[PDB]
Amino acid sequence: GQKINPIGLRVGIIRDWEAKWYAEKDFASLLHEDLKIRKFIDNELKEASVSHVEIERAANRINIAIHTGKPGMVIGKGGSEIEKLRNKLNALTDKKVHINVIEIKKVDLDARLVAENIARQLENRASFRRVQKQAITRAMKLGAKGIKTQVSGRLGGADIARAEQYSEGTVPLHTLRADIDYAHAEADTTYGKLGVKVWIYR
Amino acid sequence: AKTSMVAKQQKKQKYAVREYTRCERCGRPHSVYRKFKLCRICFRELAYKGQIPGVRKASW
Amino acid sequence: VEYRGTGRRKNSVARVRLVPGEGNITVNNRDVREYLPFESLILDLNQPFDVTETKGNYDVLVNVHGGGFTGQAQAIRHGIARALLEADPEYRGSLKRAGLLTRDPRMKERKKPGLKAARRSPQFSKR
Amino acid sequence: IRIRLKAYDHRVIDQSAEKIVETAKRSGADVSGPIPLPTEKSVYTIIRAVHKYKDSREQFEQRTHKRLIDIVNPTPKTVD
RNA sequence: AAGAACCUUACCAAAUCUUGACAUCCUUUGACAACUCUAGAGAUAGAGCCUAAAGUGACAGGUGGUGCAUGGUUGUCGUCAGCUCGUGUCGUGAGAUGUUGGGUUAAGUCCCGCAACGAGCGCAACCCUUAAGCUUAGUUGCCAUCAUUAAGUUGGGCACUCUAAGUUGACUGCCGGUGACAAACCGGAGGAAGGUGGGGAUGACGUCAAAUCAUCAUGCCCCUUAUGAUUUGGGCUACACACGUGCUACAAUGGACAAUACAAAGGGCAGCGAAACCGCGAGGUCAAGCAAUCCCAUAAAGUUGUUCUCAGUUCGGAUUGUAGUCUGCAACUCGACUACAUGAAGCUGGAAUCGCUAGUAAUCGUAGAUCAGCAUGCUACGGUGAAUACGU
């Protein structure tokens, strides 16, 4: 059961890439600055509702746009953190080309917002199935499918590793255009290093 | 084997001191300059006919 | 592309794996001038080759199948001839004067039952 | 300039081929466009470090997908 | 092992500082002991220099086994050609045809009447390979419509080939071909593409802990001036070798060693070579370019040595020891190359086992995932690549 859902070759007609820039010599350098600016925005995002990235630095228009779901206090009360982001990006290198924001329609479509309401109780080793049976029905009301509760070992609070087969729905992967979210994310809260086999789909 | 040498340049695995940082897209790894991802040979061709303000003569 | 060439000569089809560039023709993977039993015209064994103008521009490195003592000879020439047709369309128009497609309108008749050669018969046996 | 264009995937190189034609169009000089690059590569599998079934080194592929779009006569406004 | 010496040895006799080489803290202050010096084999540690270090206690560094208790599955019998589920259908209880009938490709299942219907992810493809003709480029690429043509081509983007750096036609679908009620896929001109282009990739749910504190998480474990640790008296190779594995010389239907004509996968600002430095060799060149090139090209056969002659002979990449390479400090008490000498047994072979299809299995050429001492095993594709089916 290594169902990884090869989306890499599945996307490319609707789901391109987050970073876009015309390069080949500045590619590695541009990619080096991409992760360099991602080491400060990830600590400022505080696990925000970010679906994709709008880093379109092609045609001399470099801008590290961050979705961050709905504009809350992340940008500051009236863009008060946008002026403080200048030095933030100025401390890294010398970019700071006015990063923009994007209003994400249907915020509960990624596997981050669904893991912040049904997988947020797993941090205190609590409900990991009762609350994991929910949200998929809410995702069905939105128009999509949702996530599928799954595990390979350490089932909730137990010293004995146990698997599962609670797949509420299937996942289409026989097509070469199928669009799948597949937003993987784990947290090490004094539990140990382990991998899960959770399956998601648009 | 230039395509295989231009592909494996910054491969990071168990040992990141195995990959050798050289000309990003061009060649001539030696007899140039490497520190801010810009080889003389490549930069010269990338600044051919005065492109990005980089290839100059002197003027103090 | 000049491999899998179809060339039949008096019941002697033979495929040829000719390669563009290298011209190392080694029939039976060795000498082809002291192999053919007879074949008096060893240099004139390739009539279309002269018009093809690719003598030293293709390496045979193939073989011969069936045929007779000298019937197996002059069969790879047509085998590479059909291979050159797929290798270049100019060859077809370059060999419009000759255009060798079929050169086996009959077979070999010898001892047979009833009739001498199933066509002729004995007539006034010389004394 | 005779410089290549190594992006990420196929559409990543497709959007980089049209974005380089836009920046080159800004400058007042001859600009190119589509660039023939016939597909040609290979693949192979081995082992990784820990446990991860087949297909060692979790990566897309060893494809050498690149480009060759650039400028011919670069001026002072060719930087943008 | 992402490769057994020594820094890594994380074994013990160990030393020596043992709230510690320690991984880390509030505290000061010579900020380091980089700088001289001390027990020095040495971190650790003591005035002095620009005037982590004095560190209690919070706290260490650590290889004895498992796994029949579970994880990441190292792998494994199996990637079986199959597992599936209500429903309609009913047991005193193990109850479903779930695919059901023409019947074709490489795709658990083409629709004669078949309790009627639905199983999900793999299985045809979806990931990958790619076009000979040519778009490209005509650039490190050779040339017909064009030659001063430096394999760093110095040209003319001079003429386009065999061309690289996104794929394409194509493949089932009528196909020439009739199943008899009945398609079709094979393959006929099919195009170079014998038909998923040729093809592969593919790890379906699993099973065995078989393996893993010494592959780690751990039900978690094993030392507490010693199992650590700055590291020497010193290590698992050198003695009878008990095996698998490392090439090997057993021969004249031929040996080591001449010059040597012709792809390579990959190696490289310190490193590759045309008569030259390096042509028996293990190496002591700075270095033209400095990576489509340039270097291996002093590679290879259909086109070549030599020579000693039913054998110890110029046939023996074993041991052994002064000694040159690789490392020489722990080899005094742990590896090797070919030689200044020693150069064994060895004439097709043990207990017992292993191996065979015209650009590839193999093979002249031949390759590393790489440790400060073992490259002598298959390991990359231009051409030597010569050979291909009584029998179901």
TrEMBL record, chain A:
Statement: the UniProt record of this protein carries the keyword Translocase: no
InterPro entries the record matches: KH_dom (IPR004087), KH_dom-like_a/b (IPR015946), KH_dom_type_2 (IPR004044), KH_sf_prok-type (IPR009019), Ribosomal_S3_C_sf (IPR036419), Ribosomal_uS3 (IPR057258), Ribosomal_uS3_bac-typ (IPR005704), Ribosomal_uS3_C (IPR001351)
Protein function: Binds the lower part of the 30S subunit head. Binds mRNA in the 70S ribosome, positioning it for translation.
Signal sequence interval, chain numbering: none
Family matches, as NCBIfam families: rpsC_bact
Family according to the record: Belongs to the universal ribosomal protein uS3 family.
One Pfam family, short name: Ribosomal_S3_C
GO cellular component: cytosolic small ribosomal subunit
A GO biological-process term: translation
GO MF entries: mRNA binding; rRNA binding; structural constituent of ribosome
Protein name: Small ribosomal subunit protein uS3
Domain KH type-2: 37-105
Subunit-structure text: Part of the 30S ribosomal subunit. Forms a tight complex with proteins S10 and S14.
Keyword list, A-Z: Ribonucleoprotein, Ribosomal protein, RNA-binding, rRNA-binding
Cross-referenced CDD domains: KH-II_30S_S3
From TrEMBL, chain B:
Any one GO BP annotation for this protein: translation
Record's keyword annotation contains Glycosyltransferase: no
Gene3D superfamilies with a match to the protein in the record: 30s Ribosomal Protein S14, Chain N
InterPro entries: Ribosomal_uS14, Ribosomal_uS14_bact, Ribosomal_uS14_CS, Ribosomal_uS14_sf
Record key words, sorted: Metal-binding, Ribonucleoprotein, Ribosomal protein, RNA-binding, rRNA-binding, Zinc
Necessary cofactors: Zn(2+)
Cofactor note: Binds 1 zinc ion per subunit.
GO terms under cellular component: small ribosomal subunit
Protein residues bound to Zn(2+): C23, C26, C39, C42
MF (Gene Ontology): rRNA binding; structural constituent of ribosome; zinc ion binding
Matches recorded under PROSITE patterns: RIBOSOMAL_S14
Disulfide bonds: C23-C39, C26-C39, C26-C42
Top-rank taxon: Bacteria
NCBIfam families cross-referenced by the UniProt entry: PRK08061.1
Assembly and oligomerization: Part of the 30S ribosomal subunit. Contacts proteins S3 and S10.
Functional summary from the UniProt entry: Binds 16S rRNA, required for the assembly of 30S particles and may also be responsible for determining the conformation of the 16S rRNA at the A site.
Family to which the UniProt record says this protein belongs: Belongs to the universal ribosomal protein uS14 family. Zinc-binding uS14 subfamily.
Protein name, UniProt field: Small ribosomal subunit protein uS14
Organism from which the protein derives: Staphylococcus schweitzeri
UniProtKB/TrEMBL annotation, chain C:
A Gene Ontology molecular function term of the record: structural constituent of ribosome
Chain intervals with Basic residues compositional bias: 108-127
Segments of this protein annotated with the region Disordered: 96-127
GO cellular component, one term: cytosolic small ribosomal subunit
InterPro entries, sorted: Ribosomal_Su5_D2-typ_SF (IPR020568), Ribosomal_uS9 (IPR000754), Ribosomal_uS9_bac/plastid (IPR023035), Ribosomal_uS9_CS (IPR020574), Ribsml_uS5_D2-typ_fold_subgr (IPR014721)
Highest taxon of the lineage: Bacteria
Claim: Ribosomal protein is one of the keywords in the record: yes
Coiled coil spans: none
PROSITE patterns, per database record: RIBOSOMAL_S9 (PS00360)
GO biological process: translation
Keywords in alphabetical order: Ribonucleoprotein, Ribosomal protein
Entry keyword Ribosomal protein: yes
Family assignment from sequence similarity: Belongs to the universal ribosomal protein uS9 family.
Protein's name according to its UniProt entry: Small ribosomal subunit protein uS9
Gene: rpsI
